[PDB]
Structure formats: structure tokens, C-alpha cells
């Protein structure tokens, strides 16, 4: 892997020979940013890289981005699985003029089914939309195979609102483990909250070398704090322990993932 | 024992077998059974639970305080956590009046530190009526573990809501385990999702033998659903598979767990 | 007017003849709609002509629905604002290559502007996404003007869920007005809950004659209900009196629109 | 008079200030003056509050009980039903209680009295205790902030909009801002726009105790506007598009953080800080 800044001090043509199979025999859209020293010099991260390379795409022709998906690669079954697979497959192409196209590297046979399935229900117009974006999926996937991201400037926080009560949940415990990648899965940290209801020390993750692309999970240990404040709950309580099971997908952005919580309730989302 | 079995015994027999269930109180069971009607009109657990507590709550204050300094008081703490515990209990003890009561099912010491920790900082009219919470809970589980329940007509029922989209999310995949009492932990079911967002074959859990009190996970394959509909998702997803851990606290209820959901939040409730 | 059952009791040709404004300058789809004599023999709610008119236009061609796109009409306002209008108007149609098409609920200038101002910045791909998405919606409205929708079976409920106590909310007052169109506009009952935190007598609204498309408002007086309670607020509470503002917009569907609420939060959604 | 001006006083000047923020116990405002240097520490209108109802809080239970007694019962448009079936209520409250109903509301409907009583009337004594005793406290904050003149408060109102269909802050929504009550300040006090980030241009809302005052509000959310901005998928008559949010503002000290989440089909929001 490369980092950003040494790839771009290459010679042009290193440049595009490197980023040629970003978007999978569409060499042409690496070429063409390449040809663009102004905006080669502007590009500093790679959320910016991969946004130089989207723009190149969105701003081609429908013929070329017809072209783009067509060269694009076609995609454990069982017997009839493969079967079904096969009949829809071959009827989405006919009907759509480009293959299905589907960003796999987190995915399952489960869910390849499922958007055959639901995709082939839809119009050729729909679709096209569609396809696009699992393309640029694919070719963020494959540009953060290659990019040395560990100097990136992303983090992640948290914040835990107790709206049974209408106050910062503090004092409360807060786990943090990695699901994957197989390498460094495994315990991230133990955190408490402070008085604003916001992690004690900081970022739970700070930086490229920790704040990495894959699959995480919070526990809340809400049962202790509603337990400490008298608060009444069953005694096998409705909420205890509360898993919150999250991905991170670029190591540029600030990841915002709170938890609002009551003995009855719960919600969280993609923050920032 | 069962509800009905044990209703239909001699009034004495039956005040004997419920005379602990507030502890050296045997007078709330004199006082229940001394109305042979009222006793006759009580069905199921949850309505024998609430006639002694009615009983309990409707005595004196002196009555009360009694009753709570009737409760006996409270492995793996260190010498500097038992020390903290001992000071804290007796700190408890001497400015309420009556014992630190703390129900629940498998403590950890976290949870009883923490409980302590607060509740110690807590007026003394405030944890007089947080203890008798506790004792009323405290009295529901020995209730619990000395009546067969296994004629209880509860169930536990689900509805997923794609709040991106404002539908029921049909054909989502959703697993269900139990997390505990151990003895009868692991998978309890496999369900998809119908038309309504409803669970197909109607109840995940049904009756007394496997509607139990104890601990569970949902699993909602969230990631599977969306791609059917080609929603736009990361391609490391926030969300993807989603798991729901809760509290089953009564055999008699009816527990409704949604899950709304989109692909950058998700909330949920406890239902009825 | 004329219902849907006497429509498709007349001739093809004056079927036909009809229908022939719904997709404007587009007589075609109408004479498409009715060679189709077992299809038609199908339909009996309004919900399923537009979805049979709908379909036959997403599965027409290309430049079917490019011509169709086209053969819409081009689309208050300050010096500045319209000039914006045609400047960016003018930008829009050079982009995409068919007119900008907005679904106008009778909608605002500010409505108008933002559109323009967003979509203009978008790939022609997307755009022709969503102007076939504005056609089918201009159609429906189109369609709901010309029939007959007295005998509907679509119909509103509500429920509320206290989540700070995990319950349902029992005896709440709820007010419902009609903002709009209006004709109609004005109160249409005042309800409480029963219970199961469900309006006592039903439905608030059922059938074609009063369950109608428009704009309505609950008024959940909360504030009342945790009173009741005695759940502590503030003095002056966060939450006393809350105007649930939400739109109708088929009334063949049931729209189920509850609240989830404590004193320091809510939550509302779509539910069928 | 301001906390500031108050405090710089002599004591006995605040004693007597003090002495009737708790009904008949002007030892809790005696409590307070002779501690003069944690009474020194006291900066805000808050911490005084929270300082004179520490004082109750650790007194006896019998302390406690009296203070309750010493308060009014409260025994306007009620039919002669709803009078009857108020008195009713009221004796029996206080009978079964010892001591009488009390409730801290502002500008209270019979509506919300009467639900009050007739829910409060089925607790047990031991539970009224305690939410009576949050009733006191209630009017003793009510009675401070209508003796001390708070213009000098900093607290301030900021909102967030988070389109939680798409995963993004929601840019370039208008949202508008009306206080309700006190009818004295009623009005539009304020236009704005989200930023990229999804908060208001310009920063807060209100701020200070000249604006950011106690009272009814609402928010006006342009949501239909947004959607369309996006070319996202609304019905021809939306589900969603214009959102009133309506909340109160109880203390000037307070950051109040009232922000929305929408989607198309779906809202929410919280007392945030």
C-alpha cells in the first residue's frame, strides 16, 4: 500500500498504471484524472481521490457509463439456488442491456438472493442508478486495498442521552470491541461516561491506525446506570446489556454513534 | 404448583405455601385468602402477584417499614471493593432506616456497587420507596420459582418498519435466541418476515412452556433486506445485521419487540 | 366523477378516451391499459388503475419514456427568484435532455426553488429516475381528481406508548383537525385512549367520505397524561401540548400515525 | 435584583428576600445565609436553587411533612359536576395523605388538574410524599424567577437536523421560531437555515437572558422543502413536510439542544444539552 501523498509525486503515467484497475476495465477514468494536474495537485485525502475519480465517472457520457458497467466483471449454492440465480441473472441483463452488478466484499449468498430478486422487479431506468452506485462502492473498496490510510483523520465518539429522565447518562460503562477483519478483531477499549454523558478520555477511536474500516460493536451496560438511579425497571429487566452493532467505511470522516435510552426504549444513528 | 391447583387448596394450606413470599409477613397471605371470592376471581400469576401487592400497599407506614426491615440483608470483589461495599451498606442502613434491597437475577458486583453507589446519595422518603419496589420485585420472583407457570398464555410477537421508506420490510430474514437461564439457552427460532412486516406464522414464542422468563436476541438481517430494495448502503454498511437483546419479565404478557429501521438508524420499544 | 367499477363498465374505447389526460400528451398508455380485457376485469380500487397504468409505462421503452418526459409541460416569485428559476431551468434541460418536472402539491415558490436548486446538481441518470417518479405522481393526482373515491376503505389510527414508563398511554385526549383543503378543513373529533393507549370508538377517520386526502393534525395533550401520573416534568414542561402535523395521500390505505413519547422525547412514523 | 446584586448583600437582607420561597420555612433561607462562603460560591440563578433545596432535602422527614402542610390548598371554568367531583377528589387526597394536593403547573386547564388529581388520588401515601415534595421545589423555582431579574443569564438554544433516510446532516432547511407563551413575548423570534453541518447558520437560536427566556415554543421545520431539494421519494400529498415542534424552556442558566431527526416517514427529538 501507498500513501496518497507519495502516489501523487509520481510521474503521470505511474499514476495511472497504479489507479487503472480502480474502476475494473475502465482504465480510461484514471487516465483522465491524471490529465488534470490542477485538480491532482488539490487531492490530499482519499475520501478526495476517490471523489476526483466519482466525478470523472458521473461526469462521462451515458454511452461511456453504459460501456463502464458492461465492462464491468458478471457476478456455496445449492442446486436450485444456482438455478434461480442463473435464470434471474440472465433475465436482468437482457432486460436492464448491463450485467447485475453488486458490491460483494461484505456481503453473503443470502443477500446476493435477495438483490437479484428485488433488483430484477425493477425498471431499466431504476437500475442503471443503482448500478452506478455499486460501482463506485467496488472502486472505494479497492482504492482502500491499495492506499496506505494509516495517517487518516477520522475518529469515532459517542453519546448516551437518558430520556427516561431527561439528562446525560454519566458514569455509565461502555465496552468496544472489533468484529472485523480477522486481524486485529478483539476488545478496543473499556470507557465510562463523563457528566455530559460523552466518553471520559475522548475519541473511543483517534486516527488511522486504530479508526479503521470494518465492523464494530458498542455495549451499553444501561442496567447498571438505570439501577444506580433507583429507576424502575422489571426485574429481569426489558433493556440490560444493549449491543449496538455498527460498520465504518471510511477512515477520513467523524463517525458521531450515540445511544438515546430509556428503561423502555432505545434509538441511535449515523451521527456526525 | 400451579395457579388454579393451588387456589383450589384449603385457605390455610394455601397461606402457608404464599406466607414467605414477603419475608417473616406471612399476614399479607392471612389477609389474602381471607376472602374466598376475591381469591376466587384470581386466574393467573400476574393477578395473584398484584392482590398481595395491593395488600402490602394499602397497610400502615409502620406496616411497611416493618417489612422492608424484615429482608435479610446482602466472591468476586477485591478487598478494596468490599470495603467500599461494607462502608456504603452501612452508610445505607443508618441514615434510611431499613436494609439496602437490591432485586435481581444474577447480580454482578458492578451492578450492586453501582446501585449502592447512587442510591446512598438518595433522601431517605425516596429510597423508602425505591426499596419497596424492590421488595414487591423481590416478591414476583419467588412467586415465579414456586408456581408452575407452564400454562401461562403469553407470547412474544414482532414488526419490522423500514422507516426509510415508510413500509413494513417484507421478507426479513430474523433469528431469535435465548441468552439465559442457561439450562435452556441457544437458537429458539428462525423467522422471515410477511407482507405487514410481521413475523410469518404469527408468534416467535408462545405459551408457558416456551414463553419464559429470562433473556433474549433478535437478529435482524437488515443488510439483506435493503439490498433487495437497492437501497443506497456503505460498502462497509453502518448497519447490517442488527441484534436486539432483551427481557422477557412476565410469562402472562403479551411483549411486542419491533424494530424500526433504516439503513443510518433504528430504534425500538417495549410493546403490548 | 365517475367510480372506478362504472369506468371500467364502459366500452374500451371510452375507457380510453378517459384516461387519455392522466399521462399528459401520452393517449397511448390509456389505449395500452385496455386491450388488455382480463387485466382490466382485475381491477377494483383506484390503488390498482394507477398501478396498472404505472406499469405499463415502466415497461414501455426508452425513448417511450423520454418522449413521455418531453411531452410534459415546462414548469410568486422576486426579481431574483426567477431569474434563478430560468437560469437554472434553462441549465436543466440542457443537462438531461427532457424538461424539469416537479409533482406540485399545490406547493410553494420555496418548494420550486429548492428542487431546482438541489436536482439541478444532479446526474441525468438520477434525474431521469426522478422525473419518471414526479410523472407517476402528477398522474395519481390526476386520477384521484376524476374518480370517484366516495366508497374508499381506507381508514386512520393512532396509538401511544408511554416508552419513560413502558406502557400503554391510558385516558390521553387527542384532537384531530383538517388543515386542509379548505372545504373541509376544521375539527374532526376529539378522542381519549382506552387501555391499550388506542382511541376509544375506533378509527378517527374510516371510509372514502371522511377518511380523505388532505392535511391533518393531531394535538396529543401529553402534558395531561404525566400529570396524571405524577412522573416528574419541569415546571414549565418540555412536552405538554404536541401538534402532530402529517399528510394523507391514498384513501384506499390504512395509515396507523402513533406517538412515542416520555416527557423528554418523541418519536413518530409512518405504520400501516 | 439580580443573583449577583442579591448575594452582595448583608445577610440578613437575604434572609428576608429568601424567606417565603418555601412556604412558612424561612429557616430553609436561614439555613442558607449562614454558610457565607459556600453561600459565596453560589453564581447563577441555578445553584441557588439547587443550594436551598439541599437544605430542604436533608432535613427531617418531619421537617418534610410540615413543609407540605404549610402549602395553600388549592380547593375557575369547572361545570358543577366537575367542582363537585374536584372537592371530592381533594378531601380524599388529603385524608388518606396527610397532607394536602399540591401541584406546580403553569397557567394549569382544569383539564390538567383534575387528570392530576384523579391519577394521584390512586398512589399510595408514600409515593405522593415524594412527588409532592417535586412540587414544592417546582413552585420555589417559579417564585425565584419571578422575584430575581434573570436578563444577566447565559444559557442559549441551538437545534440539529439529521436526515437519518440518508445518513447526513440536513443542509439548507428553513426552520423558523415562535414563543407561544408568556402571551406578553409571543411572536416570530427568529428565520434560519441549516448549514452544511445540519446546524442553524449564525449559531444559536436564542441566547442570553434578554431572549433565551422561560416559556412556550415551537419550531417550524421546512421538511418538504429538503426532501424535494433531494429529489426524494414523498407522496403527491407528502406524509411529511411541514413539522411543528413544540416544547417549553424552564431554565435561562440551561443549554437547551432541541434538534430533529426526519425521514420522509418518520420523526423524532429530545431535550438535548
Same mark, same amino acid.
Given at each position: 500500500?501507498?500513501?496518497?501523498?507519495?502516489?501523487?509525486?509520481?510521474?503521470?503515467?505511474?499514476?495511472?498504471?497504479?489507479?487503472?484497475?480502480?474502476?475494473?476495465?475502465?482504465?480510461?477514468?484514471?487516465?483522465?484524472?491524471?490529465?488534470?494536474?490542477?485538480?491532482?495537485?488539490?487531492?490530499?485525502?482519499?475520501?478526495?481521490?476517490?471523489?476526483?475519480?466519482?466525478?470523472?465517472? *458521473?461526469?462521462?457520457?451515458?454511452?461511456?457509463?453504459?460501456?463502464?458497467?458492461?465492462?464491468?466483471?458478471?457476478?456455496?449454492?445449492?442446486? /436450485?439456488?444456482?438455478?434461480?440465480?442463473?435464470?434471474? *441473472?440472465?433475465?436482468?441483463?437482457?432486460?436492464?442491456?448491463?450485467?447485475?452488478?453488486?458490491?460483494?466484499?461484505?456481503?453473503?449468498?443470502?443477500?446476493?438472493?435477495?438483490?437479484?430478486?428485488?433488483?430484477?422487479?425493477?425498471?431499466?431506468?431504476?437500475?442503471?442508478?443503482?448500478?452506478?452506485?455499486?460501482?463506485?462502492?467496488?472502486?472505494?473498496?479497492?482504492?482502500?486495498?491499495?492506499?496506505?490510510?494509516?495517517? /487518516?483523520? $477520522?475518529?469515532?465518539?459517542?453519546?448516551?442521552?437518558?430520556?427516561? *429522565?431527561?439528562?446525560?447518562?454519566?458514569?455509565?460503562?461502555?465496552?468496544?470491541?472489533?468484529?472485523?477483519?480477522?486481524?486485529?478483531?478483539?476488545?478496543?477499549?473499556?470507557?465510562?461516561?463523563?457528566?455530559?454523558?460523552?466518553?471520559? $478520555?475522548?475519541?473511543?477511536?483517534? $486516527?488511522?491506525?486504530?479508526?479503521?474500516?470494518?465492523?464494530?460493536?458498542?455495549?451499553?451496560?444501561?442496567?447498571?446506570?438505570?439501577?444506580?438511579?433507583?429507576?424502575?425497571?422489571?426485574?429481569?429487566?426489558?433493556?440490560?446489556?444493549?449491543?449496538?452493532?455498527?460498520?465504518?467505511?471510511?477512515?477520513?470522516?467523524?463517525?458521531?454513534?450515540?445511544?438515546?435510552?430509556?428503561?423502555?426504549?432505545?434509538?441511535?444513528?449515523?451521527?456526525?
Amino acid at each position: 500500500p501507498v500513501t496518497v501523498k507519495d502516489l501523487l509525486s509520481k510521474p503521470s503515467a505511474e499514476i495511472a498504471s497504479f489507479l487503472g484497475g480502480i474502476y475494473e476495465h475502465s482504465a480510461w477514468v484514471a487516465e483522465a484524472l491524471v490529465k488534470d494536474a490542477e485538480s491532482l495537485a488539490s487531492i490530499e485525502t482519499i475520501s478526495q481521490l476517490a471523489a476526483a475519480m466519482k466525478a470523472i465517472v *458521473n461526469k462521462s457520457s451515458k454511452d461511456q457509463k453504459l460501456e463502464l458497467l458492461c465492462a464491468h466483471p458478471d457476478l456455496s449454492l445449492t442446486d /436450485a439456488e444456482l438455478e434461480r440465480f442463473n435464470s434471474l *441473472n440472465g433475465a436482468y441483463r437482457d432486460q436492464c442491456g448491463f450485467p447485475f452488478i453488486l458490491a460483494v466484499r461484505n456481503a453473503t449468498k443470502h443477500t446476493v438472493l435477495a438483490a437479484l430478486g428485488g433488483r430484477v422487479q425493477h425498471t431499466p431506468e431504476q437500475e442503471f442508478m443503482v448500478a452506478l452506485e455499486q460501482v463506485h462502492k467496488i472502486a472505494w473498496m479497492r482504492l482502500l486495498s491499495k492506499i496506505d490510510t494509516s495517517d /487518516a483523520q $477520522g475518529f469515532l465518539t459517542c453519546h448516551v442521552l437518558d430520556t427516561g *429522565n431527561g439528562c446525560p447518562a454519566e458514569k455509565m460503562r461502555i465496552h468496544l470491541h472489533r468484529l472485523s477483519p480477522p486481524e486485529m478483531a478483539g476488545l478496543v477499549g473499556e470507557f465510562v461516561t463523563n457528566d455530559d454523558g460523552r466518553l471520559e $478520555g475522548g475519541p473511543a477511536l483517534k $486516527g488511522g491506525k486504530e479508526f479503521t474500516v470494518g465492523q464494530y460493536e458498542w455495549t451499553f451496560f444501561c442496567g447498571e446506570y438505570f439501577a444506580s438511579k433507583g429507576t424502575f425497571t422489571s426485574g429481569q429487566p426489558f433493556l440490560d446489556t444493549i449491543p449496538l452493532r455498527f460498520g465504518i467505511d471510511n477512515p477520513d470522516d467523524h463517525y458521531h454513534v450515540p445511544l438515546l435510552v430509556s428503561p423502555w426504549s432505545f434509538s441511535t444513528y449515523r451521527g456526525s
